[PDB]
Amino acid sequence: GLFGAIAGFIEGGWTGMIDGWYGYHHQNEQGSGYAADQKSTQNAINGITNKVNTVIEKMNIQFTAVGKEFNKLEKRMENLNKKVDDGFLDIWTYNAELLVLLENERTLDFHDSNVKNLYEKVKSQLKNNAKEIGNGCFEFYHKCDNECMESVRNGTYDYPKYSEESKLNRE
Amino acid sequence: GLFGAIAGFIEGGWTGMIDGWYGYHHQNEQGSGYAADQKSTQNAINGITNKVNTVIEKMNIQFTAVGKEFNKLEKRMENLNKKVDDGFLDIWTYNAELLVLLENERTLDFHDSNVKNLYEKVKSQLKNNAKEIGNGCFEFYHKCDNECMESVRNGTYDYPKYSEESKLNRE
Amino acid sequence: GLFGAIAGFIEGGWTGMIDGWYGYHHQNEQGSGYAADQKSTQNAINGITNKVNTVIEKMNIQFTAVGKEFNKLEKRMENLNKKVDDGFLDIWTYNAELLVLLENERTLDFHDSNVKNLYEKVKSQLKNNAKEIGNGCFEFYHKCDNECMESVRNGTYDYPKYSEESKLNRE
Amino acid sequence: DTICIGYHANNSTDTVDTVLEKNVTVTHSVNLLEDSHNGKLCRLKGIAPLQLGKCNIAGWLLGNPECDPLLPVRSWSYIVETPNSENGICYPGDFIDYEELREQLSSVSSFERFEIFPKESSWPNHNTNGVTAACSHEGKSSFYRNLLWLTEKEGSYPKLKNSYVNKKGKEVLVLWGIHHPPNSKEQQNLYQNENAYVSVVTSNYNRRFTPEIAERPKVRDQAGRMNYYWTLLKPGDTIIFEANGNLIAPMYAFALSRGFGSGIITSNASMHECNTKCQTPLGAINSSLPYQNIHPVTIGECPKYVRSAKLRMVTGLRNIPS
Amino acid sequence: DTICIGYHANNSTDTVDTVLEKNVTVTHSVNLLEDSHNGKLCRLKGIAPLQLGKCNIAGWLLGNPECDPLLPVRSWSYIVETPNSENGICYPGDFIDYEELREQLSSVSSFERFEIFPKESSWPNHNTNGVTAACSHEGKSSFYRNLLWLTEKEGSYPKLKNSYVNKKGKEVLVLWGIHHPPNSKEQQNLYQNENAYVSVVTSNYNRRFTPEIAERPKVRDQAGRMNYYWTLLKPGDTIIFEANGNLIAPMYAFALSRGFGSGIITSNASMHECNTKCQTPLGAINSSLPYQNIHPVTIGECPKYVRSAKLRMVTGLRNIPS
Amino acid sequence: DTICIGYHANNSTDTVDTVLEKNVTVTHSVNLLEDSHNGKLCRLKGIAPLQLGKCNIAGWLLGNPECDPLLPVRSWSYIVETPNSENGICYPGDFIDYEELREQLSSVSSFERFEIFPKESSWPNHNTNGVTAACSHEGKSSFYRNLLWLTEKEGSYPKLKNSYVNKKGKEVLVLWGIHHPPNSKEQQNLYQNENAYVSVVTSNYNRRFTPEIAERPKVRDQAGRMNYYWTLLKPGDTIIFEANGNLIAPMYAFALSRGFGSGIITSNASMHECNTKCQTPLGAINSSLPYQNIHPVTIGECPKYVRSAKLRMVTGLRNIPS
Numbered sequence A, B, C: 001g002l003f004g005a006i007a008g009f010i011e012g013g014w015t016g017m018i019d020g021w022y023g024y025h026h027q028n029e030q031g032s033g034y035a036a037d038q039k040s041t042q043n044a045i046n047g048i049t050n051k052v053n054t055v056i057e058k059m060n061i062q063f064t065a066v067g068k069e070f071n072k073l074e075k076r077m078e079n080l081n082k083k084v085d086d087g088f089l090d091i092w093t094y095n096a097e098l099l100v101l102l103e104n105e106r107t108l109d110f111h112d113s114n115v116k117n118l119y120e121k122v123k124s125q126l127k128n129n130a131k132e133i134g135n136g137c138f139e140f141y142h143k144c145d146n147e148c149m150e151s152v153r154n155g156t157y158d159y160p161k162y163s164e165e166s167k168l169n170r171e
Numbered sequence D, E, F: 001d002t003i004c005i006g007y008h009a010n011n012s013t014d015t016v017d018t019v020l021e022k023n024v025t026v027t028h029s030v031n032l033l034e035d036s037h038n039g040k041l042c043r044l045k046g047i048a049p050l051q052l053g054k055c056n057i058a059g060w061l062l063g064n065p066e067c068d069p070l071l072p073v074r075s076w077s078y079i080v081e082t083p084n085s086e087n088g089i090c091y092p093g094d095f096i097d098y099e100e101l102r103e104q105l106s107s108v109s110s111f112e113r114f115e116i117f118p119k120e121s122s123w124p125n126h127n128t129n130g131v132t133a134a135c136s137h138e139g140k141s142s143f144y145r146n147l148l149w150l151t152e153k154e155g156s157y158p159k160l161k162n163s164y165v166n167k168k169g170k171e172v173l174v175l176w177g178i179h180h181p182p183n184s185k186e187q188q189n190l191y192q193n194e195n196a197y198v199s200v201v202t203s204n205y206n207r208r209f210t211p212e213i214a215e216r217p218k219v220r221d222q223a224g225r226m227n228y229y230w231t232l233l234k235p236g237d238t239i240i241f242e243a244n245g246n247l248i249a250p251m252y253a254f255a256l257s258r259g260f261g262s263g264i265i266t267s268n269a270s271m272h273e274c275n276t277k278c279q280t281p282l283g284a285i286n287s288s289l290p291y292q293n294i295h296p297v298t299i300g301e302c303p304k305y306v307r308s309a310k311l312r313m314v315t316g317l318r319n320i321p322s
């Protein structure tokens, strides 16, 4: 992808995370589990829902449209009516197929951006109290319980609280 | 946004910075102030101005276009003329509304990219001589005067000059 | 660019690298040389080839399309036929020119993303065993031979192997 | 202790296409292309269509004897013509501005078939029982239900002259015909006048017809021809018929009401006890999707027709459950 | 000591829409949709329009007596017809190929009204003062200013024959009429010939007309009809008129000049001392914007009409001044 | 020891345009706009076109004597008319529904010119050597190759009556003419009948013609006129000609075959020993590109015409070799 997270440095997805598009998996002495990031998932849901509604909205309701009849001495008019009907159909098929293709590419990049931004949010909070071990995972240089994990999932990780213990283990 | 800077890790904008889209705020013993980054702002201005001109340029001048008249025995031709006029209007309204919507999204992401790239330029120059304190701010591990600040705003920050003093304060 | 690599922190390209769009230049005691990254280049080639094919595919084959003739008492029909022909030509010229312009911008950003992602892949592998010296180059804190270089070009760099020697030189 | 950032995966096998890549499996997707119909003719916005059965538009308007007569007053939302409309014009000839008449009917939502010139009160000095084998009914020779073949009575065809004033408050569609015998012997036998003429006038219609006698190739075993004409009589206006021969006079006319969203379609589908907002010749569409690939001909509020086989927009992520 | 990276904010309340989000407040924006007009009829590229006043195109060309006569020579950039054009054809009948004539006028930029058949020199053996109450002027019976009602003189209507050679170097539009009396008594009274005919020929026009006599519903208190015809006489060509009755002869004709960018519009707006590059029936547009939502009918170089209510492109950033 | 990440550069000078920036030099690019043609008329899908030479469609169908006669049977893929088609109708008059006939020919892929009414066997009591100076050939007066000018024989013009049954299995295009003399003296001299008429009937065609005599401006030194008519005789149907004067009778007719992808173009380019899938009036296109800016008129499978001067898609990177 454009942002390198989905199918990138995070190789695969999580079937165990059923409640959201993006989230966290934690492991400490109290256990492990998946937790969807509700804020980013809901924001993405609102944006994607708006994108689909915009696509439907931009297409007007097709009111009644039937064919016309022409006698043997109106071939030119019949061919012009056919040329008009064929030409409009060419454009709308072209417009519809391209719009889906282009918006599909943007949607995948949009999800890729959200994963990367979520990863960067955690990295900036942890700083040198944890180490990047690849695959989008961090190994803490200190004990991090469920309360500490929740402070990472939301925006309130306390870096100065664990700096001393992390420094000793980082050595 | 797609790049995570605007309304992201940099939560809000600066009303005090009036002379550019992106820039710096500094604080040292000599005082504080805003300074727009002229290079990135002017480059963005050139690109955005070109985008608007391209949108106007692609739309041709609409020359004279009036209606036609038909007698009581030319209903088919009148309906075909109406079908042509309605169909063209459908497409151009569709084309115009979608183009503005799509370019609007790209413009916001373009500004988001410029803020992020400007932030990364400073981060790479400072390295470990300063620390990320969130909200797109850096706290120097050494005294940085107006001359030192200007070397950061342009591309000529002298990392080896302050490495020794920064190391002592970083401890 | 949107991702800041091409014409960004990597100022210029390499004429000496002829076999790929992106790659590496190495320098150690055994010598120096260019090496294209075959995986990213081939993936980009597949995507770009598909983009051009999609552009050609979406345009239908133009079958026979000639003009029509009208007598002196069919001016309205002649003007309607002209209005149809002019209107379709307006839209297709508009559609073609915009599609190339928009896809051109996305293509350049696509290449910009690939350079940045390739750079980030190396940075995450090396960690603190090397230092960022700007212009997209890394200076190793340890001796790195051709075998060590190849472990960086592919995904198998051994960080623990050189951590001790790198720490001494990093000091 | 570790914490990991990741993204959703599931067992979905939906695939979408992008500019750079085809056949991308995704976690969630939305179909935008409607391809399903019920295969039936339905009421549209609660109004049943007008089915002409074995008749085409020309056969129904002229009153071809081989079609089941309709009720005096009908209202509809669209008109259905069966593909093998074998019953149309039964006496050979030309239907002048027939295609224009169909276009007029496409914006009509109701008719009232009423007697404009009563059969036994309008032509006292003329013969009115003319029938032809080309318009047979139950094996017997017959004629159009809405028209009257006037011929000589007691060896005389007096100059006829009749008028009608439109007091219906709606447009009245009047149809008539001009007969062209294949030889002068028949022209004298039927109408007793060789320099015959027909005159039809209203406030905005003014036409005169003259028989053109020649032997012609047999069509439906008729060397003669019958030309059919029509005009829309505006509310309050008068139509005057004047002839000394060859007039195929109107008997029944139609008071027409104007509506919106109607049209004429060709279909072999059958009427059913159903209601829809979108009708196609193949079937009805119940959908809120923006596009459909079922048929370019639509009645009502319908998705836009496109040629595409698949229009699927991705909403979720690339699906990598490995 | 600190340094911070940031972005601009201001007090702007402009909002734009995106694919993912509506109602986004931005620091800078550009409107692309023109919605403002001055509500006046203006000169276009320095040329005033042709205003027909109470007349429509038919009334002006025929010379309806109830419209103020125009100057002999006029040049214009567009033609304005007032919505309630009560003055058109005043004697009932059909204007043959009238819509085609309007389409021809739409590419005409100038006329010269000149005497093609002088009134007191072209018809010495015919009566030329025929007037009708259907074309009244100041309460008195009158006739078209550009046509002459020829009738019998001294109980005789000799076969007339007149021709004109186009030496103007431009197309000459010639208009004439054919009168159809409601009975044979009037036909003999006016033209003394019952088998009357009219012949009009040029190098590329060849038509013959014959009166069709029948009583008809009264239109503007006239049971008679007057059919109007026209042709464009090419430079250097001759037109020949031949009749023994029923000819409503041309008196004045128009030499026409061809231009570009003109047309016919309907408007109740008033002419003003203004100049514009873009004229609509509602008013003039002074704008360099690519789109407008004022009116689909435009004259000149105009923005493209769309149905949208708002087309605003963002140039600045998302506005977060908190 | 160092390792660097970088991207490709070369000596390319290709430039592309983007939304944000024009004139971007790139390493690799693809042209999508076809601007090259060979400047020749070629066979299309292996089938040579039909070149009318100095004749237009009307001249070829009527059989103008000044055009080289074609072979009895021809098949083609498109029809070429030379811009200065000086040879068309040679005797002045109107070609009724001529534009409709051209539209019919545009879907025709073959003709067989055959004798429908043999010259020396179909008109035994009529004169058949009528020629005119307006249709000269080699300086001598002549006539259309496909038509016969019938006139009186031995001071008599008997009522002629001839028919043809279509046994070709294909549509037969029949052309004929009606002559209108400029005075009654010539009408009696040529056809001996003043109340003359012509009747042409088939199962779906029924028209009657009457001469309209008047003196007219000279066109090609002819005060007379000749009106030309046509109809498509369906397989198995009969056409009957009936006249007592003024008939310009058919001699040769065309059996027509229907095809696809054909049309009529105007070009001064020359035929060459070449084959193409796409033909324009300026030349042939050998290209797989989606767009072309050569000509809006195309025959075959062609790129879509656009007004653009350049359509180049970037495939490689921004080129920075410094």
Ligand SMILES: *[C@@H]1O[C@H](CO)[C@@H](O[C@@H]2O[C@H](CO)[C@@H](O[C@@H]3O[C@H](CO)[C@@H](O)[C@H](O)[C@@H]3O)[C@H](O)[C@H]2NC(C)=O)[C@H](O)[C@H]1NC(C)=O
Pocket (backbone or CB within 6 Å): D013, D015, D023, D025
């Ligand atoms: C588009 O993508 C789909 C899904 O990725 C492709 O269908 C998949 O095709 C592969 C091989 O082409 C199948 O894998 C094979 O499975 C069989 C039985 O499990 C195994 O014996 C083989 O060794 C191989 O692993 C896979 O089952 C199949 N998945 C489906 C059908 O759901 C598809 O081919 C792609 N291309 C197109 C044009 O659709």
Ligand SMILES: *[C@@H]1O[C@H](CO)[C@@H](O[C@@H]2O[C@H](CO)[C@@H](O[C@@H]3O[C@H](CO)[C@@H](O)[C@H](O)[C@@H]3O)[C@H](O)[C@H]2NC(C)=O)[C@H](O)[C@H]1NC(C)=O
Pocket (backbone or CB within 6 Å): E013, E015, E023, E025
């Ligand atoms: C689009 O965005 C604009 C601006 O963000 C919205 O208008 C704003 O609407 C909010 C509430 O809907 C207003 O805030 C309210 O202000 C009053 C008085 O200051 C205060 O008493 C309330 O507690 C609340 O804070 C805000 O003033 C208003 N800004 C304007 C009008 O400039 C708008 O509603 C959004 N939606 C649409 C559909 O436009």
Ligand SMILES: *[C@@H]1O[C@H](CO)[C@@H](O[C@@H]2O[C@H](CO)[C@@H](O[C@@H]3O[C@H](CO)[C@@H](O)[C@H](O)[C@@H]3O)[C@H](O)[C@H]2NC(C)=O)[C@H](O)[C@H]1NC(C)=O
Pocket (backbone or CB within 6 Å): F013, F015, F023, F025
């Ligand atoms: C689009 O881009 C091309 C290539 O970047 C531009 O063409 C280049 O134009 C510059 C100056 O405008 C030329 O540089 C000059 O070269 C001469 C001789 O080497 C030197 O004496 C000058 O001091 C200056 O360096 C450059 O040669 C030329 N490159 C070409 C033609 O390949 C072009 O102007 C740009 N704009 C447009 C509208 O095309």
Ligand SMILES: CN(C)[C@@H]1CCN([S@@](=O)(F)=Nc2ccc(C(=O)N3CCO[C@@H](c4ccccc4)C3)c(Cl)c2)C1
Pocket (backbone or CB within 6 Å): A018, A019, A020, A021, A044, A045, A046, A048, A049, A050, A052, A053, A056, D008, D028, D029, D030, D031, D032, D288, D289, D315, D316
């Ligand atoms: C007329 N039709 C076409 C209508 C018109 C309006 N809609 S609509 O825009 F709401 N469609 C959709 C359809 C599907 C989605 C979607 O991806 N998920 C729904 C929300 O939970 C998401 C989720 C995430 C993680 C785990 C489980 C589930 C999955 C969205 Cl975001 C919008 C379509």
Ligand SMILES: CN(C)[C@@H]1CCN([S@@](=O)(F)=Nc2ccc(C(=O)N3CCO[C@@H](c4ccccc4)C3)c(Cl)c2)C1
Pocket (backbone or CB within 6 Å): B018, B019, B020, B021, B044, B045, B046, B048, B049, B050, B052, B053, B056, E008, E028, E029, E030, E031, E032, E288, E289, E315, E316
């Ligand atoms: C026919 N119309 C529609 C014309 C056709 C041509 N233009 S044009 O393309 F130049 N429009 C604009 C209009 C506005 C802008 C814009 O955002 N700023 C102008 C430059 O300073 C920017 C700024 C930045 C930071 C602080 C203060 C100010 C604000 C731009 Cl970049 C282009 C429109």
Ligand SMILES: CN(C)[C@@H]1CCN([S@@](=O)(F)=Nc2ccc(C(=O)N3CCO[C@@H](c4ccccc4)C3)c(Cl)c2)C1
Pocket (backbone or CB within 6 Å): C018, C019, C020, C021, C044, C045, C046, C048, C049, C050, C052, C053, C056, F008, F028, F029, F030, F031, F032, F288, F289, F315, F316
């Ligand atoms: C009908 N036409 C228009 C056809 C229809 C199908 N094609 S096609 O899509 F294959 N076109 C191209 C044309 C050029 C390219 C391209 O950039 N390189 C080819 C592959 O090696 C690349 C390279 C990289 C680094 C160093 C050297 C070379 C350069 C691509 Cl990726 C696709 C066009």
Ligand SMILES: *[C@@H]1O[C@H](CO)[C@@H](O[C@@H]2O[C@H](CO)[C@@H](O)[C@H](O)[C@H]2NC(C)=O)[C@H](O)[C@H]1NC(C)=O
Pocket (backbone or CB within 6 Å): A146, A147, A148, A150, A151, A154, A155, A156
């Ligand atoms: C973010 O998560 C942390 C969890 O560490 C929350 O902090 C705790 O909130 C509970 C509320 O029941 C308090 O009892 C604890 O004392 C808090 N921990 C500390 C160290 O003070 C915090 O409230 C969350 N913030 C949100 C949800 O906005």
Ligand SMILES: *[C@@H]1O[C@H](CO)[C@@H](O[C@@H]2O[C@H](CO)[C@@H](O)[C@H](O)[C@H]2NC(C)=O)[C@H](O)[C@H]1NC(C)=O
Pocket (backbone or CB within 6 Å): B146, B147, B148, B150, B151, B154, B155, B156
């Ligand atoms: C970038 O900014 C620095 C400010 O630190 C500039 O360096 C100084 O430039 C002034 C010019 O008046 C000299 O007097 C100083 O001696 C320079 N400082 C040092 C440490 O040498 C530098 O010139 C700027 N670069 C630009 C504008 O390209």
Ligand SMILES: *[C@@H]1O[C@H](CO)[C@@H](O[C@@H]2O[C@H](CO)[C@@H](O)[C@H](O)[C@H]2NC(C)=O)[C@H](O)[C@H]1NC(C)=O
Pocket (backbone or CB within 6 Å): C146, C147, C148, C150, C151, C154, C155, C156
């Ligand atoms: C990635 O590159 C490294 C080069 O360092 C490869 O590792 C060596 O592969 C060769 C195979 O000939 C072995 O003989 C060496 O022993 C390997 N080095 C070590 C340290 O074990 C590695 O195979 C490459 N991986 C790929 C190509 O997937």
